């Protein structure tokens, strides 16, 4: 495959256009529309949506009832169709059309020189500033065909336009008022299989109406797990009694993909790349979506599929989509503040409940002065506080084996816990002898068993101290560690009584500590020590030198855990997010010296290591996993929760797919 | 008329409650619920909504399948009903109930010492952190009655609880996952005439889930031109694998009427005065609303109306609602900037 | 509540009767029926089912069309109805009745002086020895009412007879051939809410037809998750061309509850107590049952519920049910052998796969010479064998700390050396002695357990192997472990599925199969004799009996565990079941291998005490230990305790309601 073709990774480029209305002049509306569609063609778009009653103007009132206007609309529409023979995108053009007795408010769905369909507006508003049932007829329940340019084409509120070469691209078209009713045609359509929901809108602008437009469009994209395309009327509509801002916007599953200047001077587009695979995946996993479709089986099987071949460009056309470098760490400072709040509080509260259950025991914790331990200790302190329990019931322990520990003791004494040292070294010596390891005879062999003796002894001592003094062993291994198997399983740091860092990726612990210093509720000196830890630990490096940088691994982990995306898709997404340090945004707290940019070769390498460790090696360590709360919306790794997977499975197909699809550089 | 009685001007006081879950202890959940409902009574509320699976705890997994638990749930539920004989508000209490073959995730709608109804959850999520189809059965399409305390009461996803003395107050009840699907029971219900939409929710909290809760609840209140009552589970739910923030909130036609402290220490309420007349009027003028109901006439006439007499206090009880001095000039500076 | 009332524990007493047919004399058939019904009444039964065409005789052919016969049938049916006013059970009597144009092959459902309903046969067989469509009419699709004794009563294949005071008791009635077709009426009815499926059957006996009766009846009870009551025609049916064996049986969820003597001289009954709660629970947990009902919603909502108040006897009437002492260990030698074969094979095969995955590592196991470690070693050996891998990759380890010396460590060394594994001993004492001192010294037993597991893990790191745990299902249930750094943790637990009552018989199975050496067999029997016999003077206070002293006898806790894990039964129901199973050692069966010196009888007091301990340790304490549990294969049908499998429960939950129920309902003695 061409790795850099957005289309070949499941994307589909869509455009929401606002054009220059020339009320009463259909030929000039068709001119503006043709020019913008030709732009969409140059941009590689597959879809282009224009505003309500595009070809005549929405605001012309009883001028819709004049035969000369309807005739010019027909002529301009046929010109448009003929011109669309050389245009890539599917044009969705509003128009007042003649059928049976009346004129209906229709969107003509045009493609490659033919009319795929004609959708009538379903609910014509007749209230306040709207007088639509005067001039036009409702379409709710109209099926059959309509005759347009010597051809009988599908007509009704029950169409679907499915791309035969892009199965993720299945189009449905409603109009303005349609999406504001309790049961919108688009919802049925989505259950019926529509993935891109289009809305043509005239929408006279008003104080607070753009807010309502966004509310309903976003809510639609989320509830229907689909993409939503909205286009409103702009410059040219009669200002006899209304004004027009020409807003266009593109939503996808609740997230604004793009939007355009309000009240512009001149035509505007919103062009974006819709990840059909993200929709596919959200729908694969949300059983209740298909359950809802089944409950409404009769309503949903009555849709008609009009198949068409899009044949998109197969080359490099960029990616009109903002792939954030940190799926777990939003780069918008306000959103990151909210995220850190939520994470920190769910950790504290999960620990609080575990503590209340056990008659308020003690909290035994081994603190190394690194990030995860620091944060876990902060968490336990707050949990104990909110429960009105002495901080002296927290028992921090520095357990040296064979510079950073000073952070740990400074922090422990600042917080007010019970600090203590236990030099496991001698117990390690004894054990290494009793098993006959070369180090007890004096040859420096620092293999795995050497290091695991110390790790397991730290955990062993903590467990026995908990048993002796009546407490519980708080864990500190974080989500990215679980995803990679970067722990000692069993007798080791993997085991504990209640891990509060279990659901937190490594990349978000840094910002949780930054958040705690910012909130600074523990005190000034405590902020000083925490800040010290932050500056000390970043310049983890040891950890990230065998499993790769956690920025790239949390990127891959998010893609896998949330979407199950194949390796090639993760490589493409990571390369667009990370390959350039200047492009895209960075979250707060990243000095320009700690703002790296990774290459495709690096992404490919760490992706190989990731698929190997996550699908295959590491699973068994998560399989027997202490309790602890889920944090991110990307998921957790509990086998009693978000990740049910086998312990004895190989990652051959993932490595093989990387081999076949991801280029070496 | 008593000019200062909010009820006599079309208002109806509603409460969204988060209580103290005691997982596995139905009697203690009923205790917390009774205390909060007694508060709602003192506040003059007509409606009080509690979280998903209130009487047993939402997070207890296969403990729902133990006969001793189900039996204690039945006992606590009957105590609650009997105590509600002296309580003004309509109690909406979650519970795992026994019907036909399985246990359904139900909300018991209780009023003045009787059970007006029993609504089952419609879409049981079985994905990610959710394992609900294991223990419980879907209610989508279940009609008929259920036997609760020597009485056959209405059972199904098609109920409406209409106040015979407050025609603007017509209640419908869905549960959690119900409002997240493309076609939620509440929308049908609203076309069918429901004005106050209740949602009992367990909702394990997550980064960005409260945003989604608000998005869908507000979007529901706007699209359905109705009031939306949301109540999530709080302190007490098993933190084996999830955490719980206990958010409660009250929306009305897209506008947040009230909300409560997230991650509280102790029970919380959101009590607000819903202007049923504002809903009545928005619906009088939006023709396309009734047009939508007509297009779905068969779906919408199949609802069952359970009538009940609320008899609210007729005196001065304040007005739990922020009436802005300038309907044209919003007092929030950011909103006023946008408006200008 | 009365603790000894089978009814107040969800049971219902049912009867399948074969009577003395007197072909052509409806009065004489009503006489036999009334006598047997009065018997069932004295027994306290709620239901009594009689054979096809009871009042007339199934075999009287065209005499069914004689008006005098039909009239005598109606007269005897009305007599029966009137007499039933003082009869506890619901009578289901066959009769050829007049409706619209023809006579239908009906079962009259009679109760307390009134006719609850009239169910016609649905599929009249007309083939081979059967000529039923000649005299009678099919009832498939007949609804409405029928006039019987000046009363309009329900008539059709769509009825349900539900007890208003016994909600688990919902009766459906079909007739003979009905249950032999691809889609029997009883399956629909079960989906519709039927719990007891009744069959009136004439059934001329033939070589192998009792086999077909049993096959289909048991299959019905299993698939429909119901009780199936069967009654066939006996002495008195015309032997002009057929013979009649009068078989009656009562099935429950695929398990034969009762049956009667074939070809008897004189009438017979099969009376049993059906556990409605068992059905209720099987249906609570099998979502696909309700899934199937919903898929056929039209068929299943069309049923009509006829309500009747049974008012059963509230006293002690015993329990006509064989409750086995060892729910995990069947007392039938053939079934126990099959069980043990299956269990042993799934353990071996699960370990085989885990090993193939890891390119065949070594197998580190600490062997103390107790049952669980012994069996785990045997399984590991067999797994290594069948995968064609050197037995010297099995690393057994005796890690003693404070034991002075005992026969069990010799058991360990002897078995390991007889198997040909790689045995080594390592005295953890010093590390514990150091460890204790370092933490500033109950605690020391915790330290030893921790250090055993720590050392095994580090040795597996050193020599490139996986620690193979030995914890069994009973220890997991009750929390008899050291969590985390302790005997709970391993890389793969082969014994997790197996309860402790079954480990002994797995070892006996291995011995009797004798696939290993005769020396291996002798040492295994030594292990059995050593561990299952209490030490005269406690050997250092560590063995199997120590766990028994703290958590109660496993014979009782495995019983409670099966009930809880499979059926979710309330404590009082468990106490009732166990008290009937165990209180009398001379009654019921024992599995093979119990010398009559090891056959105890437990009291209500003991059952109640250990049940308190059990609900407290299972619902509340021990859950957090299972929550983080190594891999391993599920063994019994009763379930496992994996959090990724059969038991999803909270770690921070109290057992208060179960204790409160034990206090409110189970007597102190
Ligand atoms: N001096 C100390 N005092 C007290 N507690 C200490 C001390 N040192 C460590 N810890 C503990 O280990 C946790 C983090 O472990 S680690 O060093 O980041 N990673 C590994 O061991 C590792 C990596 C890969 C595979 N296997 C093992 C820390 O939270 C803390 O609980
Ligand atoms: N799927 C499995 N199921 C059950 N047991 C398994 C499975 N795979 C291996 N093992 C065994 O568990 C021990 C794992 O070692 S460790 O202390 O967690 N960490 C390390 O080795 C380590 C090495 C290199 C880099 N980073 C960490 C091993 O000895 C192995 O015998
Ligand atoms: N001397 C030994 N040599 C070699 N391996 C040994 C030795 N002793 C034990 N093991 C091992 O521990 C497994 C089971 O332990 S136990 O004795 O039944 N009970 C407990 O540990 C216990 C009970 C209650 C609370 N906490 C701990 C055994 O299968 C064996 O693998
Ligand atoms: N729900 C929980 N979640 C997480 N951690 C918990 C929880 N409850 C306690 N803990 C802690 O874990 C240790 C477990 O100890 S143990 O080695 O498995 N043996 C024993 O408890 C034991 C006690 C009495 C008699 N016999 C055995 C406990 O001391 C406690 O500190
Ligand atoms: N033009 C229309 O159909 C009405 C659209 C307008 N935005 C509304 O919300 O009603
Ligand atoms: N408990 C549930 O049914 C799920 C509610 C959860 N808030 C969701 O959006 O799916
Ligand atoms: Cl072990």
- Chain C residue nearest residue A353, CA to CA: C652
Distance in Å, alpha carbon of B289 to nearest chain C alpha carbon: 33
Encoding tokens for residue C525?
A: 């029997």
- Chain C residue nearest residue A430, CA to CA: C431
E strand residue ranges, C458-520: 465-469, 492-493
Encoding tokens for residue B279?
A: 């809903």
d(CA C372, CA C469) in angstroms, rounded, equals 9
* Ligand 5 atom nearest to CA at B288: 10
Q: H-helix or E-strand containing B229?
A: strand B227-231
Encoding tokens for residue C595?
A: 């010398």
Residue of A14, A5, A11 whose CA lies nearest to A37: A14
Residue of C218, C219, C236 whose CA lies nearest to C18: C236
* Protein residue with least CA distance to atom 9, ligand 5: A177
d(CA A17, CA A650) in angstroms, rounded, equals 48
d(CA B215, CA A652) in angstroms, rounded, equals 41
* Ligand 1 atom nearest to CA at A459: 31
- Chain B residue nearest residue A207, CA to CA: B339
d(CA A51, CA A205) in angstroms, rounded, equals 13
Q: At what angle do helices C604-615 and C554-562 cross, to 10 degrees?
A: 60
DSSP 8-state assignment for residue A389? -
Instruction: Give the DSSP per-residue string, C566-632.
Output: II---HHHHHHHHHHHHS-TTSS---TT--TTS-----HHHHHHHHHHHHIIIIIITHHHHHS--B-
* CA atoms within 13 A of residue A50's CA, in its CB half-sphere: 33
* Ligand 4 atom nearest to CA at C627: 3
Encoding tokens for residue B36?
A: 């909060």
| Partners of B48 in the β-ladder | B15, B91
d(CA B78, CA C96) in angstroms, rounded, equals 48
CB pairs under 8 A between B and C: 84
Segment 44-63 of chain B within 8 Å of chain C by CB = 59-63
Could you identify the residue written with the tokens 């493609």? A111
C-alpha distances (whole Å) from B91 to each of A447, B28, B115, B250, C657 are 65, 17, 9, 16, 25
Q: Tell me how crowded residue B2 is: count the other CB atoms within 10 A of its CB.
A: 11
Cβ-defined contact of C653 to B23 (cutoff 8 Å):
yes
Beta pairing, strands A471-475 & A362-366 = parallel
Which residues are within 8 A (CB) of C295 and not within 5 positions of it... i.e. 6 or more apart?
none
| Under 8 Å between Cβ of A247 and A262 | yes
Against chain B, the chains showing at least 3 CB pairs within 8 Å are A, C
| Partners of B18 in the β-ladder | B268
C-alpha distances (whole Å) from B106 to each of A549, B147, C284 are 48, 13, 16
* Ligand 3 atom nearest to CA at C397: 4
| Under 8 Å between Cβ of A126 and A133 | yes
Residue of C45, C300, C44, C309 whose CA lies nearest to C194: C300
d(CA A494, CA A289) in angstroms, rounded, equals 37
CB-based burial, C97-129: b 16+ in 10 Å, e otherwise: bbbeeebbbbbbbbbbeebbbbbbbbbbeeeee
Which residues are within 8 A (CB) of A275 and not within 5 positions of it... i.e. 6 or more apart?
A10, A11, A252, A321
Q: H-helix or E-strand containing C423?
A: strand C422-425
Using DSSP, state whether C154 is helix, strand or coil: strand
Q: Is B89 on the interface with A (CB under 8 A)?
A: no
| Partners of B317 in the β-ladder | none
Longest dimension (CA), chain C: 101
- Least CB-CB distance to B239: which of A343, A353, A642? A353
Q: What is the CA angle C541-C547-C552, rounded to 5?
A: 130
| Under 8 Å between Cβ of A48 and A40 | yes
Which residues are within 8 A (CB) of A504 and not within 5 positions of it... i.e. 6 or more apart?
A343, A347, A375, A478, A479, A512, A631, A632
A580: left (phi over 0), alpha (psi -120 to 50) or beta: beta
d(CA C578, CA C607) in angstroms, rounded, equals 7
Encoding tokens for residue B74?
A: 């039945």
* Protein residue with least CA distance to atom 8, ligand 6: B177
d(CA B75, CA B31) in angstroms, rounded, equals 12
Q: H-helix or E-strand containing A92?
A: strand A90-99
- Burial-class residue A75 by CB neighbours within 10 Å (0-12, 13-18, 19+): middle
Q: Indicate which ligand has the atom closest to the C-alpha of B211.
A: 6
Beta pairing, strands B102-111 & B90-99 = antiparallel
Distance in Å, alpha carbon of A364 to nearest chain B alpha carbon: 19
d(CA C609, CA C594) in angstroms, rounded, equals 25
Q: Is B128 on the interface with C (CB under 8 A)?
A: no
Q: H-helix or E-strand containing A353?
A: helix A333-357
- Burial-class residue C571 by CB neighbours within 10 Å (0-12, 13-18, 19+): buried
| Under 8 Å between Cβ of C492 and C469 | yes
Could you identify the residue written with the tokens 């490594």? A506
Q: Is B207 on the interface with A (CB under 8 A)?
A: yes
Ligand 2 pocket mutation, candidates A489, A623, A646, criterion most atoms within 8 A of CB: A489
Could you identify the residue written with the tokens 């020599």? C463
| Under 8 Å between Cβ of B115 and B121 | no
CB-based burial, C248-270: b 16+ in 10 Å, e otherwise: bbbbbbeeebbbbeeeeeebbbb
d(CA C242, CA C131) in angstroms, rounded, equals 13
Q: Assess whether the C-beta atom of B94 lies below 6 angstroms from ligand 6.
A: no
| Under 8 Å between Cβ of C287 and B136 | no
Cβ-defined contact of B239 to C293 (cutoff 8 Å):
no
Cβ-defined contact of C457 to A457 (cutoff 8 Å):
no
C-alpha distances (whole Å) from A168 to each of A27, A171, A320, C608 are 35, 10, 18, 62
Encoding tokens for residue A603?
A: 């992404």
Q: Is B254 on the interface with A (CB under 8 A)?
A: yes
Strand order in the sheet with C227-232: C255-259, C248-252, C227-232, C196-201, C170-175, C159-163, C304-308
| Under 8 Å between Cβ of C436 and C331 | no
| Partners of A152 in the β-ladder | A147
d(CA C556, CA C658) in angstroms, rounded, equals 17
C-alpha distances (whole Å) from A503 to each of A356, A376, A547, A563 are 21, 12, 19, 17
Distance in Å, alpha carbon of A228 to nearest chain B alpha carbon: 13
Using DSSP, state whether C251 is helix, strand or coil: strand
DSSP 8-state assignment for residue C541? T
| Under 8 Å between Cβ of C112 and C308 | yes
d(CA C108, CA C121) in angstroms, rounded, equals 11
Spell out which residues line ligand 1, taking CB within 6 angstroms.
A 366-368, 370, 372-373, 397-400, 405, 455, 458, 476, 486-488, 493
Beta pairing, strands C47-49 & A11-18 = unpaired
| Under 8 Å between Cβ of A202 and A209 | no
| 3-state SS record for A509-520 | HHHHHHHHHHHC
Q: After which residues is chain A broken (C to N over 2.5 A)?
A: 402, 539
DSSP 8-state assignment for residue B113? T
Cβ-defined contact of C650 to B24 (cutoff 8 Å):
yes
d(CA C667, CA B26) in angstroms, rounded, equals 24
d(CA A517, CA C174) in angstroms, rounded, equals 76
Residue of C451, C373, C469 whose CA lies nearest to C412: C373
| Partners of A173 in the β-ladder | A198
Encoding tokens for residue A245?
A: 């801002």
* CA atoms within 13 A of residue A423's CA, in its CB half-sphere: 4
Q: At what angle do helices C429-439 and C443-463 cross, to 10 degrees?
A: 120
d(CA B266, CA A660) in angstroms, rounded, equals 57
d(CA A310, CA A307) in angstroms, rounded, equals 10
CB-based burial, A579-593: b 16+ in 10 Å, e otherwise: eeeeeeebbebbeee
Beta pairing, strands C159-163 & C304-308 = parallel
d(CA B129, CA B118) in angstroms, rounded, equals 26
| Under 8 Å between Cβ of B115 and B83 | no
d(CA A574, CA C551) in angstroms, rounded, equals 55
CB-based burial, A519-543: b 16+ in 10 Å, e otherwise: eeebeeebbebbebbbebbeebeee
Cβ-defined contact of A292 to B188 (cutoff 8 Å):
no
Q: Is A473 on the interface with C (CB under 8 A)?
A: yes
Segment 159-178 of chain A within 8 Å of chain C by CB = none
Distance in Å, alpha carbon of B215 to nearest chain A alpha carbon: 7
d(CA C475, CA C482) in angstroms, rounded, equals 10
- Cα B200 to averaged position of ligand 6 atoms, centre (Å): 10
The separation between CA C267 and the C-alpha centre of its own chain, rounded to angstroms, equals 30
**Resolution of the experimental model in angstroms, please?**
3.1
Residue of A472, A479, A499 whose CA lies nearest to A379: A499
Instruction: Give the DSSP per-residue string, B27-60.
Output: HHHHHHHHHHHHHHHHTT-SEEE--TTTTT-TT-
| Under 8 Å between Cβ of C397 and C459 | yes
E strand residue ranges, C58-203: 90-99, 102-111, 114-120, 126-127, 130-131, 145-147, 152-155, 159-163, 170-175, 196-201
Cβ-defined contact of C648 to B25 (cutoff 8 Å):
no
d(CA A107, CA A58) in angstroms, rounded, equals 12
Rg (CA), chain C: 30
Could you identify the residue written with the tokens 């503590």? A355
- Chain C residue nearest residue B75, CA to CA: C657
Which residues are within 8 A (CB) of B306 and not within 5 positions of it... i.e. 6 or more apart?
B109, B116, B117, B154, B159, B160, B161, B162
Which residues are within 8 A (CB) of B176 and not within 5 positions of it... i.e. 6 or more apart?
B52, B121, B125, B199, B200, B201, B202, B203
d(CA B7, CA B29) in angstroms, rounded, equals 31
Q: Is C589 on the interface with A (CB under 8 A)?
A: no
* CA atoms within 13 A of residue A524's CA, in its CB half-sphere: 0
Supply φ then ψ for residue B110, to 5 degrees. Answer: -110, 140
Q: Tell me how crowded residue B328 is: count the other CB atoms within 10 A of its CB.
A: 7
Using DSSP, state whether A3 is helix, strand or coil: coil
C-alpha distances (whole Å) from C469 to each of C396, C418, C497, C630 are 12, 21, 12, 9
CB pairs under 8 A between A and B: 185
Encoding tokens for residue C368?
A: 């103390």
* Protein residue with least CA distance to atom 3, ligand 6: B177
Q: What is the CA angle C210-C216-C221, rounded to 5?
A: 120
Distance in Å, alpha carbon of B137 to nearest chain C alpha carbon: 7
CB pairs under 8 A between A and C: 131
E strand residue ranges, A217-267: 227-231, 248-252, 255-259
3-state helix, strand, coil in chain B (%, to 5): 30, 30, 40
d(CA A19, CA A29) in angstroms, rounded, equals 8
DSSP 8-state assignment for residue B246? -
* Protein residue with least CA distance to atom 10, ligand 6: B177
Residue of A428, A413, A402, A337 whose CA lies nearest to A369: A413
C-alpha distances (whole Å) from B120 to each of A424, B71, B174, B200 are 57, 18, 8, 11
d(CA C641, CA C626) in angstroms, rounded, equals 7
Distance in Å, alpha carbon of B183 to nearest chain A alpha carbon: 6
Encoding tokens for residue B272?
A: 């607000």
| Partners of C612 in the β-ladder | none
Substitution target in B66, B97, B101 with the highest count of C β-carbons within 10 Å is B101
- Least CB-CB distance to A495: which of C434, C440, C485? C485
Cβ-defined contact of C426 to A437 (cutoff 8 Å):
no
Substitution target in A495, A624, A641 with the highest count of C β-carbons within 10 Å is A624
Give me the count of residues in chain B. 340
Q: H-helix or E-strand containing C438?
A: helix C429-439
Residue of A281, A84, A107, A261 whose CA lies nearest to A198: A107
Supply φ then ψ for residue A561, to 5 degrees. Answer: -65, -35
- Cα C463 to averaged position of ligand 1 atoms, centre (Å): 23
| Under 8 Å between Cβ of C369 and C544 | no
């Amino acid at each position: 495959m061409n790795f850099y073709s957005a289309y070949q990774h499941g994307f589909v480029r869509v455009a929401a256009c606002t054009h220059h209305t020339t009320i009463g002049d259909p030929a000039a509306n068709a001119a503006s529309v043709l020019d913008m569609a030709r732009a969409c063609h140059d941009d590689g778009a597959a879809l282009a949506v224009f505003p309500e009653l595009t070809l005549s103007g929405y605001s012309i009132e009883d001028v819709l009832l004049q035969d000369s206007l309807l005739d010019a609309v027909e002529d301009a529409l046929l010109d448009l169709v003929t011109e669309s023979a050389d245009l890539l995108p599917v044009l969705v053009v509003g128009a007042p059309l003649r059928h049976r007795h009346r004129i209906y408010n229709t969107a003509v769905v045009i493609h490659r020189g033919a009319v795929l369909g004609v959708v009538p507006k379903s609910y014509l508003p007749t209230y306040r500033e709207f007088y639509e049932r005067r001039q036009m007829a409702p379409g709710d329940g109209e099926r059959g065909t309509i005759r347009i340019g010597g051809a009988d084409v599908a007509f009704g509120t029950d169409l679907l336009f499915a791309a035969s070469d892009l199965p993720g691209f299945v189009l449905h078209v409603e109009i303005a008022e349609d999406m504001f009713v309790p049961m919108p045609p688009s919802a049925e359509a989505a259950l019926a299989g529509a993935t891109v929901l289009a809305n043509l809108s005239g929408s006279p602008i008003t104080i607070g109406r753009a807010e309502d437009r966004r509310l309903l469009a976003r809510s639609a994209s989320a509830r229907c797990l689909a993409a939503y395309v909205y286009a409103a009327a702009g410059e040219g509509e009669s200002t006899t009694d209304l004004a027009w801002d020409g807003q266009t916007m593109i939503w996808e599953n609740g997230a604004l993909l793009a939007e355009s200047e309000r009240f512009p001077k001149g035509v505007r587009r919103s062009v974006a790349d819709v990840d059909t695979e993200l929709l596919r995946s959200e729908r694969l996993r949300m059983g209740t979506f298909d359950d809802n479709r089944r409950h409404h089986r009769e309503l949903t099987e009555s849709f008609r599929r009009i198949d068409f071949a899009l044949d998109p460009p197969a080359g490099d056309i960029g990616l009109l989509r903002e792939v954030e470098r940190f799926p777990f760490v939003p780069a918008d400072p306000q959103r990151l503040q909210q995220d850190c709040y939520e994470a920190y509080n769910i950790q504290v509260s999960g620990l609080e409940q575990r503590l209340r259950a056990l008659d308020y025991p003690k909290v035994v914790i081994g603190v190394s002065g690194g990030l995860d331990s620091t944060h876990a200790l902060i968490v336990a302190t707050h949990a104990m506080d909110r429960e009105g329990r002495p901080r002296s019931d927290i028992l921090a322990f520095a357990l040296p084996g064979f510079h950073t520990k000073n952070n740990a003791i400074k922090l422990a004494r600042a917080l007010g816990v019970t600090f203590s040292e236990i030099d496991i070294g001698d117990t390690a010596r004894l054990m290494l002898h009793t098993i006959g390891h070369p180090y007890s005879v004096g040859e420096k062999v620092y293999d795995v068993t050497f290091e695991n003796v110390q790790a397991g002894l730290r955990t062993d001592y903590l467990f026995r101290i908990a048993n002796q003094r009546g407490g519980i062993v708080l864990g500190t291994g974080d989500l990215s560690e679980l995803a990679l198997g970067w722990s000692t399983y069993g007798v080791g740091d993997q085991m504990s009584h209640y891990n509060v860092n279990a659901g937190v990726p490594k990349t978000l612990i840094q910002h949780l500590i930054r958040w705690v210093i910012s909130a600074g509720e523990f005190g000034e000196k405590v902020g000083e020590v925490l800040q010290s830890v932050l500056d000390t630990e970043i310049t983890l490096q040891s950890s990230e030198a065998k499993v790769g940088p956690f920025a790239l691994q949390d990127f891959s982990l998010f893609q896998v855990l949330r979407y199950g995306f194949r390796p090639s898709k993760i490589a493409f997404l990571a390369w667009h997010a990370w390959n350039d340090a200047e492009r895209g945004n960075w979250p707060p707290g990243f000095p320009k010296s700690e703002r790296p940019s990774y290459s495709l070769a690096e992404i490919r390498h760490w992706l190989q290591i990731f698929v190997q460790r996550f699908y295959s090696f590491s699973q068994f360590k998560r399989s027997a996993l202490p309790n602890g709360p889920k944090v991110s919306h990307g998921g957790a790794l509990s086998p009693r929760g978000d990740w049910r997977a086998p312990s004895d499975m190989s990652a051959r197909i993932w490595l093989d797919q990387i081999d076949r699809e991801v280029p070496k550089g």
